[PDB]
A paper describes a structure:
These crystal structures of Ig fragments were determined at 1.3–3.1 Å resolutions. However, among the seven [name] structures reported here, the complementary electrostatic potential surface pattern (negative in one end, neutral in the middle, and positive in the other end) has been only observed in the three β isoforms, but not in any one of the four α isoforms. Structural analysis showed that B and E strands constituted the core of ABED face and dominated the trans homophilic interactions of [name] [name]. Electrostatic and shape complementarity had been observed in all [name] dimer interfaces. The electrostatic repulsion and/or shape non-complementarity may avoid the binding between different [name] isoforms, resulting in isoform-specific interactions.
Recently, a shortened Dscam ([name]) gene family with tandemly arrayed 5′ cassettes in [name] species has been identified, which encodes ∼50–100 isoforms. [name] sDscams could be classified into two subfamilies, [name]α and [name]β, containing one and two variable Ig domains, respectively. Furthermore, the cis interactions were established by the three FNIII domains of [name], which assemble into a cross fold with a kink between FNIII2 and FNIII3.
Residue numbers in the entry: 1 to 95
């Protein structure tokens, strides 16, 4: 079965300095999965103000603390298992 991400969206009224957490979760498909987050095209990993964390076998969290205008942009989660891949995106707008 080909894996499929449940669409995600950032909150709609994000202001400077808030924390933002979004979740990339698999609705169809069997683990184990790889989860990868990208901002535009660069791979994101835990560090600075960012957290990228597997929450359960079906889910990856992206957390962004003390959000700034520099955090505005398109964020993509890619999930991959032995049977295929899927990708979901959403745009973070601040202030």
């Amino acid at each position: 079965d080909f894996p499929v991400i449940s669409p995600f969206t950032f909150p709609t009224n994000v202001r400077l300095g808030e924390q933002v957490r979004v979740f990339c979760t698999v609705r169809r498909g069997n683990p184990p999965f790889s989860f990868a987050w990208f901002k535009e095209g660069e791979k994101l990993i835990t560090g600075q103000h960012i957290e990228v964390e597997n929450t359960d076998k079906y889910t990856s969290k992206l957390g962004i603390l003390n959000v700034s205008t520099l955090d505005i942009g398109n964020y993509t989660c890619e999930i991959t298992n032995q049977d295929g891949k899927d990708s979901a995106t959403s745009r973070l707008i601040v202030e």
